[PDB]
């Protein structure tokens, strides 16, 4: 990150070792669940591109994931260079491989600031979303409430898979409205259909509390 | 949060990356148990509205929960604007979407301080209470001691569900006084009725120690 | 690590007690999984050779692991002294046993910096790679998808073992391309062969989602 | 104004009775009712003999749409009941379509009827698209035909329909066909899908 | 603008229903849709009940042809979707037809539909031409009629079609007709083959 000096100069504060260790734990233990994206967003708050590259050096242990992460970063950099044909930050400068750290500080501290950090964070989040989409164990259509599974657990699994699949907004709305009811077990599906169309998730959860 | 400079000026200290990661872990892993409210209160100590919005960007992954969190925030903001018809902080300013950070510092550092942070924290806690009330797996009437469940575990589950359901104070007192005894298994229910009315929880727990 | 003083002098900041405790937890609890190398890389960011020796004092509890870690460090130091026949840092100085801390600061703060810390980190990572290669439970050829194991879990186990075995790059590419398909169960192996040669891991994972 | 042809009326009644309510009824109605006035539309609806429950639902939906029109809009301007043709006369209905700028009362009523018929078709479909699934020995061509008929009777949005087309067709097939479809993999076209799945 | 006749619409639906997708449906469509606009062609396709697999394939081929037209050609000009009528409107279609020189969106869409229907017929050929074998007692008349119906359905290239007519016709005949055809020899026209093979 970037922190004011005692005299006010913005000097780069290196990302702490335990923050990197936490990111490593998320990458290794979590097996690219849908929750690695909120955790990445939390850990990389205010991180510069050099810090983001330091973090991706930990996910570099995985071959395919790092490969398509860098390919998505390259695609986004090409898009930026198309939109954007000290020096102005180029697409490769945002990646923190051709630019130097002092240039990163100058870009992040400008008036208004040049959000190179947030741009690179968004690109990396797109790559992580693709990786998460690969690693999901089951598609949304596979999820179905068990004979005795409570509706809370089934809804949690359904929304986890929905976050994993990353469908469009309208498709997601239709899925949450209809496919959730369709996949529910018959005992709860009866109450879900009794509630009728337009049933908010609050009503669906309260009505099915303890049915299983 | 807000921290004094070396020269004494109150400069905003950004919420640490690991604090945000801890909040993300609470949101994702805990599945909105009743304990996410104490954990939110601990993590957001002294947080400004911008920090609270940064934290809610992590719970934004959930659709319905974030939706009714923002709707409860809007209701509370409307209530504030009804009560309240640099500039005085408006309801939307408390939400940290129309106000700027420097205005937040000015409001929090006033003499006496304008507790915008605590007000927004209370609103967010109301929203989280509603979300927790949805996600409870069973109602209070469902809880019942098992054939061999120790009374300590049964009381812990009962009080967890009681925190989840968030009934009124008088209703909560009646429930803890009577419904706890009623739902207990017969072997412990005999001792509970033998103790008679007005039995404090200490006496009930000590009398039933090791009965199961 | 090394941190600027209030007056700008680079004074050594001792590695925090909790960072050492985290490294101890990684060494003891993880049983030298393949993930101890990313975790070591994260924890030892910017660490000087004295800090690295302090960290290896924790892995010194294990006899054989510490023995071959120090033997690999000695081999790399001999290689450095062959390449390299205040004073210039010698191979033993990089190990942080003959050099003093102030010399380490002088070497790390030079223009351009003398990356003694990163060199020693690379040597220690080579030693840890050897130790991990010993402690792997099964060879790559042993891994095989179960009758009902999802392809995601099987791929995760396969890539964990691949990281453990540390084969050459071409051998690793051939293994991931062919041995992964060969070891898969017949139901998924049919789809893997149907995809044909040159199937990227993304296509293989998406095609086999939910087959088990 | 020209009266609706008796041949056209007989064709409309015949297709309604024969098809009961299949998804083709909506384009058939749109084709037959080209430029028709509300009087002619009411004639076409009233002339239907059977399926009087469905005709009652169509009347109810027309009433709801008329109420919504009256809510939004509280010769003379036409109200909802005027658009429905219950109150408007034939001369009045010739009016409102020649003012230029007009208010196409006939097309506005046709829209309400089309919405009602979409509801009727969606209910009359035998099963939902998610419930549609290939049999153990069903031919894949027949299963595709049933699936796309149900999808036509679905009433979902266009993006949702595209997602259904891409995913559910592969997902719902029996394992013998599903293995072949998975081997073909994503991005394949329906022609390749059945030519591979011909067996 | 002239709306399409209910008689013509019902004739198209009836011929599709009764002939399934025999090769004559392509010329029947070309005849009935003469001068039709994109809206009229969309009605013509949508009104077809059953064979929704084939209608889906026609829609997919329409989308592919629209995409190719868009790459070839990247009031507003017509896109492929506009030509297909999904995005454009009847007023814009009439304007494109009326422009000097005109942009024949109707003929382009008809060509796309004809390509789709050709693919449909090629698939819906019930049996491959290699399996058309004369029975022990079947007339050569019925045998060659079946053979040429299948050959029209297959829609193979000219050279392979000529080879088929030269070789498979005599190869697949029953022994009684096979001997006569072999004695007659190669380099023969169909009228010669049939008039020699009578009885």
Residue numbers in the entry:
A (entry chain C), B (entry chain C), C (entry chain C): 1 to 85, 96 to 222
D (entry chain D), E (entry chain A): 12 to 85, 96 to 220
From the reporting publication:
The mature HIV-1 capsid is composed of the capsid (CA) protein arranged in a conical lattice of hexamers and pentamers. CA assembles into a conical lattice formed by roughly 200 CA hexamers and exactly twelve CA pentamers, the latter of which facilitate lattice curvature and closure around the viral genome. Monomeric CA consists of two folded domains connected by a flexible linker: The N-terminal domain (NTD) faces the outer surface of the capsid, where it stabilizes the hexamer, while the C-terminal domain (CTD) forms dimeric interactions that link hexamers together. Here, we present cryoelectron microscopy structures of continuous regions of the capsid lattice containing both hexamers and pentamers.
